[PDB]
């Protein structure tokens with residue numbers, strides 16, 4: 244009856260999960276000849292042996308990452324006997340990353356993917372990887388840098404990898420290499436050697452690598468000025484690139500040259516790169532270059548271009564004007580221009596991008612833009628996303644609802660300096676479907692005159708501002724508005740009524756008023772025929788309902804409401820009246836993180852369509868009022884993180900549709916079949932983790948949990964005992980509780 248892979252857990256997909264279990268050896272675990280995938284991430288296995296994997300002879304995939312880290316954390320050296328991995332003749336994937344080994348173990352020729360990253364291997368020679376002729380992917384990053392230091396550098400002897408006749412992917416970052424290793428296999432398709440000390444590159448460093456698809460050589464000549472992490476200052480003032488370096492790479496699709504101290508672009512570098520789809524030139528000194536270079540003239544296939552964090556070569560500079568060669572980038576889909584810095588976004592700034600047929604995404608964060616003629620973005624062919632967040636725009640020139648993914652025309656103006664919204668700032672932006680103005684300082688009585696041009700806007704995020712919301716005409720100029728986020732609206736400083744506008748928003752489906760400053764003149768009714776989701780989290784619904792009749796019907800006029808979030812409202816009680824006067828259409832109610840101690844369960848009949856009820860984080864001390872009533876449609880009940888010590892028999896019994904019950908993080912000493920009846924065997928999840936279960940020998944609860952074992956999350960090791968003393972904090976399977 245016990246889970247077959249105790250103390251580990253079956254993730255049905257053949258994956259035996261033994262991650263994070265403090266194990267010091269490979270578990271031996273009802274046969275194991277059918278397990279093909281084993282994960283042992285972040286245990287404490289420091290020694291591997293000849294017979295450790297004999298019972299796992301059919302493993303295909305094996306992850307031993309982080310068992311014995313170098314330093315690392317807060318010293319460790321892993322020993323590995325000769326035949327250890329030879330036991331697994333069909334092993335295809337092995338991860339030995341983050342382990343203190345100095346030499347690569349002997350390995351079965353069936354291997355295809357191998358990781359040796361973050362180890363202490365400093366030398367790769369021919370003996371290192373015999374005879375891995377089926378190997379396709381090899382990673383060995385980070386064996387010699389600040390987080391994992393070596394004295395010297397890692398050394399890849401010439402031709403050492405030629406025995407890997409099938410190698411397609413090779414990564415050797417952060418290894419202090421001073422040159423690209425010699426005589427690499429011609430089969431290579433991906434080569435990453437970023438963040439070493441390769442200050443010079445030529446056609447001599449990429450010899451016969453004619454099948455290269457992606458090449459990453461960035462971070463080899465760094466400017467360490469203002470670097471978040473320890474950096475090694477390049478000798479030269481720029482990476483040395485011979486102009487014919489990349490010429491023979493006719494299949495190059497991705498090239499990365501970031502953080503290379505480049506000061507000039509040369510058309511030569513790209514002359515052979517004609518399949519080039521992705522190019523990263525970020526963190527260089529190409530400000531001036533991109534204002535005038537001819538380099539982009541033939542980059543006709545380029546889809547993605549990163550120009551972010553490019554600095555100025557000379558203090559004397561002209562206002563940003565992208566080069567005319569940019570007009571040739573007809574395949575361009577995404578352009579990243581974060582962190583370049585320019586005060587001014589005008590009709591010439593991005594002019595040469597305007598006619599590009601496929602340009603959908605424009606990153607413009609962190610540029611300190613304080614003058615923006617946003618109307619230019621109404622003249623582009625195919626824009627879907629423009630990100631102007633984190634700038635200094637303050638007006639016209641002279642979790643989140645913003646999803647919105649991929650499909651809608653979206654602009655992000657969050658984290659700017661907007662104090663007042665003027666309609667003129669939106670001229671020519673009438674196709675916009677999603678807009679964010681969150682985290683500005685908008686202090687304004689909104690009244691239907693702010694957003695006139697936005698006739699198509701569907702999603703509006705105005706969270707974290709300072710809006711007056713008493714005007715019933717608010718947002719009346721947005722006829723297609725479906726989702727509106729006004730969470731975290733404050734009022735640091737007596738007419739109309741707060742939220743009166745809701746009933747006039749004919750298309751509104753989703754509304755957030757969460758965490759709002761709410762004063763005495765709130766509308767006593769929210770009214771709508773269209774709202775299906777209301778988030779009223781973090782307000783004072785407790786004090787409001789304490790007023791008596793006044794707000795007794797606050798949510799009732801929301802006809803058709805399906806989901807209501809009243810979490811964090813400092814509710815201590817919930818009269819039947821308050822429940823009966825929520826809209827009868829309600830399917831989901833969240834009362835998470837309140838102070839409810841008692842809840843008459845039979846009163847759920849006042850909510851006939853309820854399917855999901857969240858009472859987590861309150862202080863129900865027992866499930867005992869109390870029973871789920873005939874004939875509730877409740878499918879899921881979360882009563883986790885309360886202080887439930889007991890449940891009345893038959894509590895869940897009448898809940899014919901019940902599928903999920905979370906009972907975790909309570910103070911239960913047992914879990915009892917009598918609480919449920921036959922309902923227990925239709926449950927899809929039964930969560931009983933973090934309860935002080937009493938692990939006595941006679942303990943009835945084991946039988947129940949084993950019966951529904953497939954349905955209890957973390958059953959194998961994650962369900963612990965509170966008692967007795969020797970089993971405190973230990974798995975309920977640490978001993979055999981069935982023996983009595």
Ligand SMILES: *[C@@H]1O[C@H](CO)[C@@H](O)[C@H](O)[C@H]1NC(C)=O
Pocket residue numbers: 387388389391392393394395396419
């Ligand atoms: C990398 O090599 C350089 C050579 O100048 C040396 O300063 C450093 O010891 C190496 N880095 C580390 C700490 O691994």
Ligand SMILES: *[C@@H]1O[C@H](CO)[C@@H](O)[C@H](O)[C@H]1NC(C)=O
Pocket residue numbers: 510511537538540541
């Ligand atoms: C692109 O190719 C043309 C010939 O097809 C060549 O004349 C031109 O100079 C190239 N562009 C640049 C600036 O390298």
Ligand SMILES: *[C@@H]1O[C@H](CO)[C@@H](O)[C@H](O)[C@H]1NC(C)=O
Pocket residue numbers: 883884905906907908928930956
């Ligand atoms: C049960 O509730 C707890 C809250 O602490 C959560 O961590 C856990 O993921 C929940 N289980 C399910 C099935 O969501």
